[PDB]
Amino acid sequence: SRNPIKYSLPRLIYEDLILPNYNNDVDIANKLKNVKFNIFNPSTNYELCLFLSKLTGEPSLNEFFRVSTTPLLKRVIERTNGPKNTDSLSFKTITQELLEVTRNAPSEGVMASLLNVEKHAYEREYLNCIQRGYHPNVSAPPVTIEVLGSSHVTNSINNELFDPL
Amino acid sequence: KSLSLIAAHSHITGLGLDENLQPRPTSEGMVGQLQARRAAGVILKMVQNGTIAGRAVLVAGPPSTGKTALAMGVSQSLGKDVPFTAIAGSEIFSLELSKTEALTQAFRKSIGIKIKEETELIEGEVVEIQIDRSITGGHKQGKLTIKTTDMETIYELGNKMIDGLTKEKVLAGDVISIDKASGKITKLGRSFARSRFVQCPEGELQKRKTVVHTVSLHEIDVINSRTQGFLALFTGDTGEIRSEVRDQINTKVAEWKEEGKAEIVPGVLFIDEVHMLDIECFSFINRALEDEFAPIVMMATNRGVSKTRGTNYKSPHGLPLDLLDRSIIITTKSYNEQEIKTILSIRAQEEEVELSSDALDLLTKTGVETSLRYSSNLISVAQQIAMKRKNNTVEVEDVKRAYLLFLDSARSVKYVQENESQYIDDQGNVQISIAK
Amino acid sequence: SLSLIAAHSHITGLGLDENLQPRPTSEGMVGQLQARRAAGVILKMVQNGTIAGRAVLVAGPPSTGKTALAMGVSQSLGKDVPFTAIAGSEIFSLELSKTEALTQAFRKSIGIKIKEETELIEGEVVEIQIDRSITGGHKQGKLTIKTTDMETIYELGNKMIDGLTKEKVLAGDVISIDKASGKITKLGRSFARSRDYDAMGADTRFVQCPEGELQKRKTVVHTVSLHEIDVINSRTQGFLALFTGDTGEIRSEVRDQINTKVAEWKEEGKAEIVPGVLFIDEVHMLDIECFSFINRALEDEFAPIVMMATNRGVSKTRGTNYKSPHGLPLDLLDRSIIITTKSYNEQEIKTILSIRAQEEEVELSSDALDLLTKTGVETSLRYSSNLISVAQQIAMKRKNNTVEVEDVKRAYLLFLDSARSVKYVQENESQYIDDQGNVQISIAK
Amino acid sequence: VTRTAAHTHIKGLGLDESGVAKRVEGGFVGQIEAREACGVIVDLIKAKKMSGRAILLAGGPSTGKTALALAISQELGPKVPFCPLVGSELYSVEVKKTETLMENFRRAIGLRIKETKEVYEGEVTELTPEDAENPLGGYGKTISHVIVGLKSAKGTKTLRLDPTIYESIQREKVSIGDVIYIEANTGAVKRVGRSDAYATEFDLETEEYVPLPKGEVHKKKEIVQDVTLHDLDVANARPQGGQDVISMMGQLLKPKKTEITEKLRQEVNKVVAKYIDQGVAELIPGVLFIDEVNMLDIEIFTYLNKALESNIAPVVVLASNRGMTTVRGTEDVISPHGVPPDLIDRLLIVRTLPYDKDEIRTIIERRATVERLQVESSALDLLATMGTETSLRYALQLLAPCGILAQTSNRKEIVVNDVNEAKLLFLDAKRSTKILETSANYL
Amino acid sequence: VTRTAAHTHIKGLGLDESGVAKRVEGGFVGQIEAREACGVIVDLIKAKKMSGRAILLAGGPSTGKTALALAISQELGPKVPFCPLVGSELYSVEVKKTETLMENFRRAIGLRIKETKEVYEGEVTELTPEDAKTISHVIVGLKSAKGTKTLRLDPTIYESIQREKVSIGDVIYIEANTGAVKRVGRSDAYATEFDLETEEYVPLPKGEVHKKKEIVQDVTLHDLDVANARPQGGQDVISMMGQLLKPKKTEITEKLRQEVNKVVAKYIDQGVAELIPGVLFIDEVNMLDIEIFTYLNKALESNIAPVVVLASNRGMTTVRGTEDVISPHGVPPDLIDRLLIVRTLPYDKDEIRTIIERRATVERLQVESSALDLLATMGTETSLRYALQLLAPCGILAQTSNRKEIVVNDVNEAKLLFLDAKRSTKILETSANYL
Numbered sequence A: 001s002r003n004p005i006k007y008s009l010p011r012l013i014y015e016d017l018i019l020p021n022y023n024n025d026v027d028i029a030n031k032l033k034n035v036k037f038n039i040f041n042p043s044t045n046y047e048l049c050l051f052l053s054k055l056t057g058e059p060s061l062n063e064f065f066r067v068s069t070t071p072l073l074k075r076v077i078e079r080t081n082g083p084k085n086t087d088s089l090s091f092k093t094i095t096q097e098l099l100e101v102t103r104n105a106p107s108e109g110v111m112a113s114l115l116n117v118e119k120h121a122y123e124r125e126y127l128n129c130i131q132r133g134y135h136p137n138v139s140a141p142p143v144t145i146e147v148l149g150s151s152h153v154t155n156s157i158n159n160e161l162f163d164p165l
Numbered sequence B: 001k002s003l004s005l006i007a008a009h010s011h012i013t014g015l016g017l018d019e020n021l022q023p024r025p026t027s028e029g030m031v032g033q034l035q036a037r038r039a040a041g042v043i044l045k046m047v048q049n050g051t052i053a054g055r056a057v058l059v060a061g062p063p064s065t066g067k068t069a070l071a072m073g074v075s076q077s078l079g080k081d082v083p084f085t086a087i088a089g090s091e092i093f094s095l096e097l098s099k100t101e102a103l104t105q106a107f108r109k110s111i112g113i114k115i116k117e118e119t120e121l122i123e124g125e126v127v128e129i130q131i132d133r134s135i136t137g138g139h140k141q142g143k144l145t146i147k148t149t150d151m152e153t154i155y156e157l158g159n160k161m162i163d164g165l166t167k168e169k170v171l172a173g174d175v176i177s178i179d180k181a182s183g184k185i186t187k188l189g190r191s192f193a194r195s196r197f198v199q200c201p202e203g204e205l206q207k208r209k210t211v212v213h214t215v216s217l218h219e220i221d222v223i224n225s226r227t228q229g230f231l232a233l234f235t236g237d238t239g240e241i242r243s244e245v246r247d248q249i250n251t252k253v254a255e256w257k258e259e260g261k262a263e264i265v266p267g268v269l270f271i272d273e274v275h276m277l278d279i280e281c282f283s284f285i286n287r288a289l290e291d292e293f294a295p296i297v298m299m300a301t302n303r304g305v306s307k308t309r310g311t312n313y314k315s316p317h318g319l320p321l322d323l324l325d326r327s328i329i330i331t332t333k334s335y336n337e338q339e340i341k342t343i344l345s346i347r348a349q350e351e352e353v354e355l356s357s358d359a360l361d362l363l364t365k366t367g368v369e370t371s372l373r374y375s376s377n378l379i380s381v382a383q384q385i386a387m388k389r390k391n392n393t394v395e396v397e398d399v400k401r402a403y404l405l406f407l408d409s410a411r412s413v414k415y416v417q418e419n420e421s422q423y424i425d426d427q428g429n430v431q432i433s434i435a436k
Numbered sequence C: 001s002l003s004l005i006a007a008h009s010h011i012t013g014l015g016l017d018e019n020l021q022p023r024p025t026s027e028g029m030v031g032q033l034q035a036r037r038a039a040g041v042i043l044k045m046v047q048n049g050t051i052a053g054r055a056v057l058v059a060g061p062p063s064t065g066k067t068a069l070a071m072g073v074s075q076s077l078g079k080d081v082p083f084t085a086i087a088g089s090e091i092f093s094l095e096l097s098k099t100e101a102l103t104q105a106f107r108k109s110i111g112i113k114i115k116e117e118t119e120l121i122e123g124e125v126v127e128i129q130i131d132r133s134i135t136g137g138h139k140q141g142k143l144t145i146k147t148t149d150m151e152t153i154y155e156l157g158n159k160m161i162d163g164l165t166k167e168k169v170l171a172g173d174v175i176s177i178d179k180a181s182g183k184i185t186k187l188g189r190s191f192a193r194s195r196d197y198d199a200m201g202a203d204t205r206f207v208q209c210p211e212g213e214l215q216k217r218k219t220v221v222h223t224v225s226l227h228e229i230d231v232i233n234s235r236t237q238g239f240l241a242l243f244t245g246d247t248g249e250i251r252s253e254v255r256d257q258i259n260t261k262v263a264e265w266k267e268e269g270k271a272e273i274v275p276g277v278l279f280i281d282e283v284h285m286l287d288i289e290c291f292s293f294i295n296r297a298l299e300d301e302f303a304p305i306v307m308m309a310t311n312r313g314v315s316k317t318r319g320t321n322y323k324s325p326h327g328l329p330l331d332l333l334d335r336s337i338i339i340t341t342k343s344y345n346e347q348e349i350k351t352i353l354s355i356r357a358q359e360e361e362v363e364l365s366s367d368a369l370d371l372l373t374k375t376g377v378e379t380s381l382r383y384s385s386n387l388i389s390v391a392q393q394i395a396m397k398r399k400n401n402t403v404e405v406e407d408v409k410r411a412y413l414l415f416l417d418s419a420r421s422v423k424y425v426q427e428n429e430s431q432y433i434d435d436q437g438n439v440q441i442s443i444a445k
Numbered sequence D: 001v002t003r004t005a006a007h008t009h010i011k012g013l014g015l016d017e018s019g020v021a022k023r024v025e026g027g028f029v030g031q032i033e034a035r036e037a038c039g040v041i042v043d044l045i046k047a048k049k050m051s052g053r054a055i056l057l058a059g060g061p062s063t064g065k066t067a068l069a070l071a072i073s074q075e076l077g078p079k080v081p082f083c084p085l086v087g088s089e090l091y092s093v094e095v096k097k098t099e100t101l102m103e104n105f106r107r108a109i110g111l112r113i114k115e116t117k118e119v120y121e122g123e124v125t126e127l128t129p130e131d132a133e134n135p136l137g138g139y140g141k142t143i144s145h146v147i148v149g150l151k152s153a154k155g156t157k158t159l160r161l162d163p164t165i166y167e168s169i170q171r172e173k174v175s176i177g178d179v180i181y182i183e184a185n186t187g188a189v190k191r192v193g194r195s196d197a198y199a200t201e202f203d204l205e206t207e208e209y210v211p212l213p214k215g216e217v218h219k220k221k222e223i224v225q226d227v228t229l230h231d232l233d234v235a236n237a238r239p240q241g242g243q244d245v246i247s248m249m250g251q252l253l254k255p256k257k258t259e260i261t262e263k264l265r266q267e268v269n270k271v272v273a274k275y276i277d278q279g280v281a282e283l284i285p286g287v288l289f290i291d292e293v294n295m296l297d298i299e300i301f302t303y304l305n306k307a308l309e310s311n312i313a314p315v316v317v318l319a320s321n322r323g324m325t326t327v328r329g330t331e332d333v334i335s336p337h338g339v340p341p342d343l344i345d346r347l348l349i350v351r352t353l354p355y356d357k358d359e360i361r362t363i364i365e366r367r368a369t370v371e372r373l374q375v376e377s378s379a380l381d382l383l384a385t386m387g388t389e390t391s392l393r394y395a396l397q398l399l400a401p402c403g404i405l406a407q408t409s410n411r412k413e414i415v416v417n418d419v420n421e422a423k424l425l426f427l428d429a430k431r432s433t434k435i436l437e438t439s440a441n442y443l
Numbered sequence E: 001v002t003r004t005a006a007h008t009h010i011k012g013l014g015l016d017e018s019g020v021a022k023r024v025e026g027g028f029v030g031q032i033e034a035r036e037a038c039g040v041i042v043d044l045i046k047a048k049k050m051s052g053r054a055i056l057l058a059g060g061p062s063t064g065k066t067a068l069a070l071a072i073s074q075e076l077g078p079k080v081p082f083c084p085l086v087g088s089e090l091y092s093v094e095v096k097k098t099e100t101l102m103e104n105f106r107r108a109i110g111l112r113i114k115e116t117k118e119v120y121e122g123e124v125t126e127l128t129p130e131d132a133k134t135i136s137h138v139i140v141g142l143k144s145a146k147g148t149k150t151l152r153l154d155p156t157i158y159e160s161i162q163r164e165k166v167s168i169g170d171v172i173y174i175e176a177n178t179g180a181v182k183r184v185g186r187s188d189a190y191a192t193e194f195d196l197e198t199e200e201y202v203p204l205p206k207g208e209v210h211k212k213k214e215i216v217q218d219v220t221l222h223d224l225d226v227a228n229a230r231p232q233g234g235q236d237v238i239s240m241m242g243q244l245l246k247p248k249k250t251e252i253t254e255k256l257r258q259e260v261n262k263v264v265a266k267y268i269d270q271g272v273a274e275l276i277p278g279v280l281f282i283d284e285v286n287m288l289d290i291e292i293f294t295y296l297n298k299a300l301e302s303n304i305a306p307v308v309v310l311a312s313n314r315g316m317t318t319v320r321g322t323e324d325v326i327s328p329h330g331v332p333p334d335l336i337d338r339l340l341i342v343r344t345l346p347y348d349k350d351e352i353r354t355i356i357e358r359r360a361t362v363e364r365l366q367v368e369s370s371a372l373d374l375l376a377t378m379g380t381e382t383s384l385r386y387a388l389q390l391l392a393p394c395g396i397l398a399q400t401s402n403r404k405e406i407v408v409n410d411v412n413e414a415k416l417l418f419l420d421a422k423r424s425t426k427i428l429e430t431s432a433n434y435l
């Protein structure tokens, strides 16, 4: 499936404004703004990393630089509930303490029934046997981009649009 | 291509001018306003030369006197490959973009970058596709014979191009265009073999096509900005592009111009009803015109000594005097009986309506006496009343019936002033009941 | 090395004695004896720490030294005591409410002090070998850790192994492990292996191999304001919102929990409360709702000492239609003690201009200094305080070291003050755009 | 039996074959010139040749302005799109009012498309995925292909898929013995249900059982779709229904209107023009009716001055009930109907006269015979006196309390005593204002 | 060929080595005192020792304030950061106006980094990785037209090579310092393995494999402020599709500021970075709200603030956001006391005539002497900018009748065709229905 709207682009913009080459400094500026001058670099800002690890109680001091250099969805996907030491400024809320107990609590419990009113509303009003009323009229894929004579464009578009992770 | 039913400016093919910028009495759907047409021709020639930038020109006059028609003719005589942005005064009061951001986007939408690039393509009629594969499909060998009207050949294909041919299924008798570098195979249809339909391509199979690409600087700004992708050109969610990327694209455009890889194409930004922008917008406008990468701004308004928005005083044409100092003003004039008659005859010819001569004279008289647009609406209203009586030529009685049924400004305000008690006034008072 | 010559960088603390008696000219600032004595009393208030929620108000004419007084009290406050400086225009935000903005400005200026014992083992890795059991649940590891002077060998647990596989080392990177807490970081790659890989890469970096004793004992004192605790507690990953300002109306229940747990930590003995000062530039342009929130939030236990600066007279207050003294309403002014900064004379202006010349590395003659003092008498003081630098630029334009009378006269002739510009406007009003926009651009009638 | 709400006694303009309006037809009483003008613009819209033509319905309250709009909406039928609107709709908190006006402009241009679809459907017999050589290689997929055996009536096919179609197939949680519906246009699949070739009475999943699909597995069928241009702009602005990353991710973000760019509208118009030029599509322009146009401020009128000059502009119908009222957003500009003169010059004002006493009486007769109520002639004359004395709508809305007070006394007819009791119970605007003037503490 | 837009006839302030301004030098005619004051300010900026120095140049419309600021920016060169700004642009719908004011303050402070660029490019002839499932390294051989060169590589660049689908025979691009990997395409020698293939075939690089080049990187403090303050997260190398969530501008807190400052100061102390403070130029300062003036009060007392140049064309005008505060040039009396006011003067007939002559000779136009006198008379009678803007329609009308010179008839025709503000106002007052 391809979108009928075709956004043509010249090659020169892609070679000289996105792809690094010998005559530009996209990669050098990316390294300068992301690696060397990053305020979470432990080689230059170890005091700030120690301060933040004392605050959050994270076991790894390299984690803030890892978080600030990765996209949001990649941060969402491999988020692992690692253990945090109790000698830290991170706390437990009242709401988190209600939420953590009621993860595997069965029915006829006080906290479980008081914390699951939306599922009681779901099974009360027979929501698993109701027909669908609305469907969209037009459905379309995202707009395709063609660059006449660049397989790198096709490879990058196929990598973004069909990310295996 | 370029669908349209009938527009109000659909009869304007272009500016009617000679080789010496002399306006004809009637040419290309534009009659009258000789000095305004000559001034717009001077504007068009200055855009066509492209040697200057950032010159603001204001078009002003009475309402319904050729103001938007001049800009429509300018955009028509500009042709393709030159940008023409047409925004209104209320178009920049957004909720996700500031007024200066919207004005900067409207400015950078009207300057083109022209890049000519060459790509090899293979376009021909497919004769037969033979694909052989193993039991598990580890290796696939394929022979594709393909033909034109002049020559035919057989090609040995690797496994990736086999995977690109069983995808987007190509059978015998189909014509396709193959991009060899990117693998984009588009089916143009079927050839003349029935036993869609499109003729078999002729000439050489491997054609070297040079495509002249044009693009706006605003299009390259969102591409070079990493916070948003190219979809912000289509969903309109660019969201306050910073200036540090704007200096980068400006310096890269200057470098491309110095190296000869691209040529600048200046265009026209047209703002109709410019008298509704705030003073902040004008304060951005009068300094945005002093930049090399700025278009020629066409401004249109019909107000006279009106209140400027965001202030308490009144200014000529709704604009402060510094912007009027930076602008050259084209003044349009009203229309006589003959000009209105020729305009209505042009609208009758353009709407496929046959008119009686006496009906045309009555329409001209009521167009002079009330308004040009009132006759320009009744000339298409009365054709339906004519077709209710089942005859082609619209007579005087149809125009009289349409004038009786549909009121104009003066008759309606006269009826309102006669029956003020039945309407809701400025104090919210109304009398609905008939008696008492 | 990222601080040029500011407006008041010559001021280093409050020039007071041990008896809170201000010296006539010491620690960068001259004069204002009663104001310096009162600001020293406020300095003793903050350094005592036994009081909370007290509001003072420096009030004077423009170019007098209210912000100079607050800069002096900030410099004499010292390190590890929080001092934040905001303006009246900081509060009005778009996505963030006004009263929570005063809440954040209140909680940015009160901190807690914690300390801990850190036993760092920082060196270059030589070799890591892993012993795996038959069950594979627990893995033993031997780590060969090296510095320039000595190298030792440690045994590692399973969590050490699975934390070392993350941020992977490859036998020659430099790491530091805390023995007490198990904190793991990768400091980078040692310079002894800089020529081994022929292409530098992206995710790594080169630092020098550490030397000395491998086990280093060092205590570190952390001063954390309550705003960092609130932003960290509000989110799963709160440091990004701490450094990007995306807090977004933190709820009151987490503030109550943080206040109660900070109080019980003070009772336990882990932390101690370090109060500070909140300083507001030009407090007259706050809304009356901001003034209501100011006079209510000063009655809470975890509230800093707030000092405000105003240079307005009897003017109107924003959000209303009446006029009040200092532009602030009467229900706030009685919740304050008033500091008055009085105007200067020829001697204090001469001393301030001499100090500004000496701090800017500008040398003046006596007659040029007297001329600048006369100009600062007839005009204001900041006009002369810019005239000294402009006349210095004219002085090395003349290839002369010192600043003479001619340089000051040329700088006075080239650059105009307020009164001369007002005279030139009022004598040439036709060529300038007025209130109604009328102007006469052309030169011919 | 049914439900009536201030309308549905109007079925159309009720004109003759020559366009002359009958006096009592289609539930209408009077308004002969207004109904003739509405018929004229009905033929103008059914001509389907004009763009940017607008009328303005002017008159007092309770004269039949909105009723004429519902009449032209019913006369055009449900095939031509009709978009009712109010002047307060355009003020959105998520996008500017200019974009809301342009979206409602594009929502009145319909489109009929005869679209062909490639359909692979049948009962799933086998489901065997083949794995990859290195599933933890970072790049690439977990599996290589998926073999699906589809069997329908008189046909049986074996399908080898990519991973990508299989992601959507296993998103629907299909299994062995379930009949599926692989639409090959967008890659979307639909779990049709369980097959009744196997058992039925051994399920707990409230399932439904459908027989085998007739015909072969591979199909090409023609579906006639009726969409608008605004739906095309929305579907291209927020893309959903592909088998890519963004097509998944668009269905889970919160819906929000965005400022649709003019370039997207050009591309949509270009592909619609190439659809029409192939003989596939058909363009159906419609009506955008904006009731209470005086509620608009001056900027929306200013953008209307441009949007009525666009080439794909619909026919706009405006209704107002102001005499000489200052336009909102301005202070000194006094204009008729609350509509500024620079757009009034582009309009065609249709006047709507008020009614007489006999017209009031027969309107009460029609509303009584529509609401299923029988009234006496004396009560009919009394209600005609109500309509000519206080308001037409007050007599219109007093039929049902009269009927209920008749039904509570075990009676079908309505007498004058019922109308007197309904007078005593319910007030009108004039009597409420009169008791508001001589009031103790702001009644 | 060349584009001229109301400027580019000026190249500098036209001063001598003693700071004296000449008559017609550098495209500037007249205005000796304002030009010498701006030269003194330029020398103060080049001294690089003062922070928060604020001047304001005030005068009539079409007197040369923007030309003076442009001459300052031309005299300072492209090395010094220059931030042009219009006082309407500070109003934003995403962040507060004062946040945009500080963002524009920190856009005018620049840094200079002396970096290097080491590039290996060529055809891959050998890609042999070795492990000990965990790869240890990979020996990569690159071949160009002038020889071949073998390289050892770290496993992260090997993983990036596997991401780019690099096989034997692909012309690749390797940057040494950052590990950037770009696949140019397959080599031309492997173009005959199939008669038709989806791969593009690029030729061999004609230079050497190893290329070394010394560059100089110029960044601003606002760029480093926005690099550390991405709320959604760090972007990848190539994202042609956008982020799923839209990143709006955020309230960049003060806590990030001294951390960025101390990182920059630590890099400066090592001698890698060179600090160049620059010029923030704000035009139409009267359009600012009083709250932006209040933040301009406290933002000029900072230690890192640049030199702020303001311009206005007003007299006794009320300040925006106030009712009863009449103040000169639209600036409140708090900010004027921290400012230095530079006077700007109007012109006479001779300076207007020479300015029109310079604008004619920069646009490649030939005018007669009598046409020049008529242009000067028109410029004195109506406006200087009207006479400047009527030069190019005069050139069009001269090109219409096939002449290379502009005569009096072209000037009369062009003044009949286009109207100034005064003639249009006279038509406006004596017209019935809205002109």
Ligand SMILES: Nc1ncnc2c1ncn2[C@@H]1O[C@H](COP(=O)(O)OP(=O)(O)O)[C@@H](O)[C@H]1O
Residues within 6 Å of the ligand: B008, B009, B029, B030, B031, B032, B033, B062, B063, B064, B065, B066, B067, B068, B069, B070, B302, B343, B346, B372, B373, B376
């Ligand atoms: N010279 C002309 N030739 C043809 N049509 C014209 C001419 N001048 C005006 N018109 C018609 O008059 C109508 C009003 O003109 P327009 O420019 O749209 O309004 P305004 O002048 O108020 O901006 C338009 O529909 C246009 O077709």
Ligand SMILES: Nc1ncnc2c1ncn2[C@@H]1O[C@H](COP(=O)(O)OP(=O)(O)O)[C@@H](O)[C@H]1O
Residues within 6 Å of the ligand: C007, C008, C028, C029, C030, C031, C032, C060, C061, C062, C063, C064, C065, C066, C067, C068, C069, C311, C352, C381, C382
């Ligand atoms: N008592 C003082 N001693 C030294 N310098 C002073 C004194 N008072 C004011 N100044 C200087 O005058 C300059 C401007 O005065 P400022 O403190 O801004 O006045 P205000 O407090 O009214 O705003 C500052 O740079 C400050 O250093």
Ligand SMILES: Nc1ncnc2c1ncn2[C@@H]1O[C@H](COP(=O)(O)OP(=O)(O)O)[C@@H](O)[C@H]1O
Residues within 6 Å of the ligand: D006, D007, D027, D028, D029, D030, D031, D060, D061, D062, D063, D064, D065, D066, D067, D068, D363, D392
């Ligand atoms: N000609 C008519 N025939 C029948 N009912 C009518 C007629 N004209 C108006 N009405 C009734 O009068 C009421 C007011 O009409 P409507 O157009 O909805 O509001 P308004 O007239 O105030 O704009 C409607 O409920 C409608 O049923």
Ligand SMILES: Nc1ncnc2c1ncn2[C@@H]1O[C@H](COP(=O)(O)OP(=O)(O)O)[C@@H](O)[C@H]1O
Residues within 6 Å of the ligand: B290, E006, E007, E027, E028, E029, E030, E031, E060, E061, E062, E063, E064, E065, E066, E067, E068, E313, E355
């Ligand atoms: N001394 C001068 N030499 C040359 N051109 C000048 C001189 N002074 C003013 N100008 C011209 O006057 C025009 C208006 O000046 P500008 O600074 O742009 O606006 P304003 O003076 O109103 O701020 C500019 O285009 C500039 O070229």
